Symmetry: D2
Subunit: 334 residues, 4 copies
């Protein structure tokens, strides 16, 4: 191992599960939210899953405020929406509160893991479900029990080892379309993750083992745009067709940011209007949306509660956007 | 965990390394081939790296018979070619299917992975001890520790070139690594991968004791692109030119390995010979940037399916279709002739 | 194999350390007690180390009441005694028997060892957090990692003073250690033990991650003998002088700790009061070699057998009750101020 | 941990079991030998168990030559003697000296314990594969995992016969276990240890994977005392009588193994033949409680201090040499024949 510089010890998942066990409150939040998203995916609930929050968590304090503001609207709009905080601990092409909690290249990953599990625990304990991005094959063991929904990143949707992981997660999973607008790799990923798999993974004890999964049927596509936005009713039509042709539920989640916002946080409100019109009009296929939002709109490379990663919408727009979606949902229902 | 049906004990890497230590000659094979490829990547040698052999290993008997034949050509053609055999134990599937010898050596969904690891490492050991270096695809995050000391070159497949955990893996590998262009032909994901892999990373991984740990890598500078086509093949001079400029633009060496198979053959195995003819004219006409090729070859041409029912023919691929030995011998001589012409 | 019926999962030390980390107070209590005991063993403190408490812990409830009472006397008699509570979570049996709180916290042969570990470390942590140092017997080769950071002093049982693995264990322990004389009163075994424990060793052990490893220790100087009688008691100033002679002959400090129980009490808890008088007579009369004493004390004197159990009474060896305990500590604190 | 200087990786047992797997020959040797000692310990065989071999192993080559010679005798005398080779790797020592083959295979204080474990297991494997059963000493709780599958009989250190942890270990051992009498000669501890060891236990151990776990044992019924002397030898008929007596009271089979060396020979290797003569008298006279003997034997008698060393000569305690060993074994066989008819 000439290219390995150092090897340092890592707390087994059991260490963090023992220090920060799920309270009865937290367990209930996870259970109910998973259950509620399953009902939506099976078409037995006309409500809309709303996964919304910062692009990346970098300050537990700002994150807990956001969680309290969001919890309020979650309880206010629960008849129309299943609201889940985005708590993302990040894929790049050149990387998180877990991988470097002190954001200083000290890579205090054990501390990062402690900070992240506590935050997720605290959010779930309040009654707010959480959502995460699963990029690593080892980290999920420390956090998955506090996750009600997760996303496989667009750069890993085609990866066999991430489809294996998805096939064994206890929460539903979204797969993003290709960095070009194509759905095939995401349809393939849903089909793969739906099947059982046998593969090597690290256990709660931190040792490697052979695991066998059952397959995950709570997997769905996420429309994130390509060279052009793909949230319009024309694109929704195409995706639904490609899903029926593949034998999958004609369901989609629409990501209002990234390629779909044209890379302009403000445009997420445009996507919202468009999407609300489709739902208000009777589009039952849109079962969920994803929105990058924070306390303060904008970005930075530190202001309190403002993103250090992608640019997000602020709280006022967030409140607005969330009521629009809840109103679109009543129109589709009554 | 409720979608986790069962958990089973897994031999740690140390137990495989102790049971199957590298011989002196196997370690010499690995060290010499890695150095030789480094020299080609450095432009300090005009030979061509040839990664050639089965799509997937499913039969140690046929693999060793194939290795003997390839070794004889490796020795005959070594002034021109650095021949490394494809010993691929891990297959990425488009959706589902047999994932290779390690995941399921009995090819019947018994998933006897401890046996698969023993079988795989013994075969790699035997092949290297004979003097033939080996190449593999690094797909799984945990299997590399069982095998990497016997690998002279590795590939990251097109479906994982964008994957951060695969780029992290390459930054700590002791062998040179090729990154495939994207399944749609995109070159940029591979240039980014090479740059990512050239840098040090700190990430979670598993040690030779089978325990997760925090690891720090130094970056791997022996990485390069593999052209494997997109919607259309991308082996022709026009494409090699675009890729050279893209690489230089990003501050990387302007050099490529060309996969004759997969989308560059439109998945028609005999078309590898057409790619070969075009690439040999490129090399013989003076193209120095083509430092390597990849070819899917076996003893018997074509392929067969485990789902057919028909008994398995010996020495015939059960994954992608491959050229047979006769075409393989003729292809290798074509490449060696072209490298010689490029030189004179 | 044939005589192994089942194997079950065991939390690694790092899981106990993370859930139940030392508070600053706990870290203080342990640090100072260790320093304090060190100063006594280097003969720079005239005080007496007193290792007193239940024979075994079986009830964090009764154990917590005791710790409050003892802590009061530790703070009052602190100028003469260094009080350290017995918190024994594991017990060596003569043949078989309940092995202590860790091995079987529910005293019913259910061997919920993971709960035992949790229960034991939370208690140890609270006792320390309150300011009361703690002592234990290090019997198991694997449990020490879960508890030793909360131990101010440790003991190697008489039936293991001669054990290589235990002598090795003592040489890497962060706390002072005492070796009980042989069960038949033999003093040599413990002198040898002290000497080994003081040297470095290289041996196999289990790390804080639950993994076996090769360990090198530095050797432990802060080790001493513990007199606990043999075929008859051996606490009398005659025996003490003989021991101080072997210790000198052997090159070691002529220092001793006296256990008023086990063989020195003929297994009769009340005779611990008798031994207290004899040793106080030696200490008031000038004996500067008695650096410590061990006493089996509990809330309610006597002992009971193992369904509902009587509060405050030992399920292992018989102990003196709290009444006798408070007088005993005042007897010792009186003998010390005399020597000074 | 402030008195902990360093921590180094240790190969897990599975790593050595994979590298050096029991052959079929080796497995049968262990199984058959373990079965034959059970029968002897159940009064169902009248043959004598003979654990004999070097005080400790420092040279696998000499050890293999010794094993070859003993194997021949083992076959020649099989109707009378169940001959098991002593394969011990260390001399437990209260003062410093060579730490044995596993601890320090290279005899230079380099503590190449990984090297030692490999050497030690490969030796036990080779010996068992040849057909010769092996006996070992269990001194710690971790090394047995790497070796016990090739052990047909085991002994607990005399300094740890009273230790609960070693009694727990014996309760899970797959081989019969001998327990040594106290150093002053008393048998109470070996009786307590037999009782303790015959009971099921639950305790923490390291597994084949090198991880700690909770284990439960069934208890070991094939345990017995080893007479190794006190202040005075304790092999004579008078002493056997006392021990048979105390065993019958404590509810245990009145049977013993007699260690001819150490205190029973006044630390004089040649006097193992004096003990042999006496024991052979007792046995040929009908004594049936003597189910076994332990002898320290090597190719070349005596010992040497650890530059080239003498081949086949102990570097720990002094042993009888091969000529005395062959004669001792024939003495034992001949007595066994007299006790029966
Ligand atoms: O080995 C290589 O160089 C590869 C991997 C390739 O062999 C893949 O595993 C099958 O083409 C998938 O086959 P399916 O599409 O049937 O899953 N290049 O892509
Ligand atoms: O705690 C101590 O200091 C000890 C241990 C002592 O408490 C022992 O555990 C019981 O006497 C066993 O009792 P039994 O003899 O019933 O197994 N000293 O010997």
């Amino acid at each position: 191992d000439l290219r390995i510089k150092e090897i340092k010890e890592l707390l087994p998942p059991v260490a963090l599960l023992e220090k920060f066990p799920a309270t009865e409150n937290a367990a209930n939040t996870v259970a109910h939210a998973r259950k509620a998203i399953h009902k939506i995916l099976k078409g037995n609930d006309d409500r809309l899953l709303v996964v919304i929050g910062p692009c990346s968590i970098h300050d537990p304090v700002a994150a807990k405020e956001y969680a309290t503001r969001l919890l309020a609207l979650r309880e206010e709009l629960k008849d129309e929406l299943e609201i889940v905080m985005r708590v993302y601990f990040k894929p790049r092409t050149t990387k998180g509160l877990i991988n470097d909690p002190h954001m200083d290249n000290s890579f205090q990953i054990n501390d990062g893991l402690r900070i992240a599990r506590k935050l997720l625990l605290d959010i779930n304990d309040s009654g707010l479900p959480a959502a995460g991005e699963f990029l690593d094959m080892i980290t999920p063991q420390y956090l998955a029990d506090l996750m009600s929904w997760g996303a496989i990143g667009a750069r890993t949707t085609e990866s066999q080892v991430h489809r294996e992981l998805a096939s064994g997660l206890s929460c539903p999973v979204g797969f993003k379309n290709g960095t070009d607008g194509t759905i095939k790799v995401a349809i393939d990923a849903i089909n793969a993750a739906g099947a059982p798999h046998c593969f090597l993974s690290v256990t709660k004890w931190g040792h490697s083992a052979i695991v066998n999964t059952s397959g995950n049927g709570d997997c769905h596509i996420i429309l994130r745009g390509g060279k052009e936005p793909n949230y319009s009713a024309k694109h929704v039509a195409e995706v639904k067709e490609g899903l029926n042709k593949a034998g999958l539920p004609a369901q989609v989640m629409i990501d209002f940011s990234h390629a779909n916002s044209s890379k302009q946080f403000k445009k997420q409100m445009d996507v919202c209007a468009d999407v609300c019109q489709q739902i208000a009009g009777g589009e039952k296929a849109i079962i969920g949306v994803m929105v990058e939002s924070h306390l303060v709109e904008g970005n930075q490379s530190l202001a309190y509660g403002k993103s250090i990663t992608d640019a997000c919408i602020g709280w006022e727009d967030t409140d607005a956007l969330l009521r629009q979606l809840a109103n679109a949902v009543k129109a589709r229902r009554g």
